[PDB]
Write a protein that binds this ligand. Structure first.
Ligand code: H8W
Length: 237
């Protein structure tokens, strides 16, 4: 991972991309929103594990550290994917190709329109910056590695794990800058755009926190992936 060139980092990320999934409803039948969005999220999570395992550096970490990082990041990862899919659909959220929803559709669940609104604004910001696919994959990998890295332990192994994570992040920063130099931006423009992109990450965190509050308020054993389910899926033979 740490020996990859910028172009090889980019190719590895683009190749790791998960598929776009569909919602499971009978489209011949009349048009619950939360059950549909929960089922979609459950299925995406499996693919997210596969993706995370292909982000360079990720499998170099301990299984316990892989679990912690996904546990911290999984709703942010789903959200950044949604915002990206929704970028060329002003005023709508493309949860799936057969489930494109507007903000009024979110009113059907108390607390949800607020979240819908924040996600639509972030998609709006992406459109204003003209975010590129290569930039988006870098940013999603940055969420995975960064979100849980401040909440681990100071065993010697933990100290080595945090160092590695920060080295892999440094390589993604290099790759982002490379992408922007290749596009022909000036050095000033490169650093300004790097900052703009990373500051949107703060908002994506905020959104995930607000959503997790909603999910925990359902008080449901079939909602939010447990440590153990994540551990079971990541602990592959
Ligand atoms: C209140 C928010 C958390 C609503 N979010 C907004 C982002 C999102 C959802 C579903 C599929 C998605 N695809 N891309 C993004 C995305 C939706 C949601 C709904 C239920 C769960 C529950 C999951 C479980 O209980 O295990 C998770 C996420």
């Amino acid at each position: 991972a740490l020996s990859l060139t910028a172009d090889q980092m980019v190719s590895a990320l683009l190749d790791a991309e998960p598929p776009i999934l569909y919602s499971e409803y009978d489209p011949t039948r009349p048009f619950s929103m939360m059950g549909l969005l929960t089922n979609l999220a459950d299925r995406e999570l499996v693919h997210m594990i596969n993706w995370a395992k292909r982000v360079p550096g990720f499998v170099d970490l301990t299984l316990h550290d892989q679990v912690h990082l996904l546990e911290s990041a999984w709703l942010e990862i789903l959200m950044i994917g949604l915002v990206w899919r929704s970028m060329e659909h002003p005023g709508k959220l493309l949860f799936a190709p057969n489930l494109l929803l507007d903000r009024n559709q979110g009113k059907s669940v108390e607390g949800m329109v607020e979240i819908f609104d924040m996600l639509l604004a972030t998609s709006s910001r992406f459109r204003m910056m003209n975010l590129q696919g290569e930039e988006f994959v870098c940013l999603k990998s940055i969420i995975l590695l960064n979100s849980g890295v401040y909440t681990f332990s100071s065993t010697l192994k933990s100290l080595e794990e945090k160092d590695h994570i920060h080295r892999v992040l440094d390589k993604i920063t290099d790759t982002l800058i490379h992408l922007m130099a290749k596009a022909g931006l000036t050095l000033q423009q490169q650093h300004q755009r790097l900052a703009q992109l990373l500051l949107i990450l703060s908002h994506i965190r905020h959104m995930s926190n607000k959503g997790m509050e909603h999910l925990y308020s359902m008080k449901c054993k079939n909602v939010v992936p447990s440590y153990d389910l994540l551990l079971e899926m990541l602990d592959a033979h």
